């Protein structure tokens, strides 16, 4: 990918870049999933051994406070601001807010809201005054790459994201193990109740939670499952990684072309009865200028 920016890249030291990041040593892990209920079109399989070079990865998704500092320093205008609208979950649109008649096929719970963007996540009249440490949302893949580049970083590949999110466990269902609520404790912010009609908020949140909510995984990463979907570097496909080759098994970058970029980790909207996509092997995609109230990102870096 060759992005275009209207801000200069500032000089930063290795110590500055590594703050808030964990060092993932080089090595192998078992990527992918073979849950019999996985949707074939998602390409969770095959399970395969992947070798990665050492890398750094953020413990936390990028926060509102951090994104605000980037915008302050650069004047960056997000894709949602250029388009003038972004996707908001229906239950979060305040009555009377102007909304477009737009229909996401098969997903009527998404509302295209004029003026929804990172600083006004439910549209005009909303703000982030009480969410400085929540993940920034309404950021597209382009916005994420712009932030990461300004920060001296990059987006993780899907393999890097998944190795870090798995937190040293071999082929567990979730970042922390195989039970969704071990010892009856919520470990991530997803949906409880009847999707898309009623979220009971049993885990504490019916929207985003602070980036440091819940226990971390074994590598010290927070909210890799749930909270917000997280953009990765790779172009999406369902089958590129079915090939057995060095390109797909050593520092894999994904296919060289595509139409949508990978997103990992699930969000506050995920539920077993509909998508079941908060398992660590799960994966989906979105087109790179798209944005939504449940999608953000975390950065990676070469050491």
């Amino acid at each position: 990918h060759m992005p275009s920016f209207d801000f200069d890249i500032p000089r930063r030291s290795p110590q500055e870049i590594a703050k808030g990041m964990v060092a993932i040593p080089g090595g192998t892990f078992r990527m992918g999933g073979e849950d019999p209920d996985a949707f074939p079109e998602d390409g969770e399989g095959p399970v395969r051994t992947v070798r990665l070079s050492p890398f750094l990865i953020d413990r936390y998704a990028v926060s509102n406070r951090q994104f605000a500092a980037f915008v302050k320093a650069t004047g960056y205008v997000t894709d949602a601001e250029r388009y003038g609208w972004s996707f908001v979950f229906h239950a979060h649109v305040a009555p009377g807010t102007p909304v477009m008649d737009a229909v996401v096929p098969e997903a009527p719970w998404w509302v295209a809201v004029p003026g929804a963007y990172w600083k006004a996540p439910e549209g005009p009249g909303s703000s982030i005054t009480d969410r400085p440490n929540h993940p920034v949302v309404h950021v597209s893949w382009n916005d994420a790459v712009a932030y990461a580049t300004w920060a001296g970083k990059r987006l993780p590949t899907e393999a890097e994201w998944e190795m870090a999110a798995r937190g040293g466990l071999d082929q567990a269902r979730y970042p922390w193990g195989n039970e969704l609520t071990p010892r009856g404790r919520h470990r991530c912010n997803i949906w409880q109740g009847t999707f898309p009609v009623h979220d009971t908020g049993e885990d504490g949140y019916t929207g985003t939670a602070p980036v440091n909510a819940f226990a971390p995984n074994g590598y010290g990463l927070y909210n890799v499952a749930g909270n917000v979907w997280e953009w990765c570097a790779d172009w999406w496909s369902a089958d590129w990684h079915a090939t057995e080759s060095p390109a797909t098994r050593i520092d894999p970058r994904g296919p060289e072309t595509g139409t949508a970029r990978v997103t990992k980790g699930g969000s506050f909207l995920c539920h077993e009865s509909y998508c079941n996509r908060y398992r660590v092997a799960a994966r989906t995609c979105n087109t790179p200028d798209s944005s939504a109230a449940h999608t953000g990102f975390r950065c990676a870096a070469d050491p």
């Binding site: 998602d42 996401v104 098969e106 998404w110 909207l269 995920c270 979105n286 798209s290």
Partner: peptide, 14 residues
């Protein structure tokens, strides 16, 4: 009925 949708795209509403 078809694959569940978690990523709503700007292209999808056209």
């Amino acid at each position: 009925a078809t694959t569940p949708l978690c990523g709503p795209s700007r292209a999808s509403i056209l």
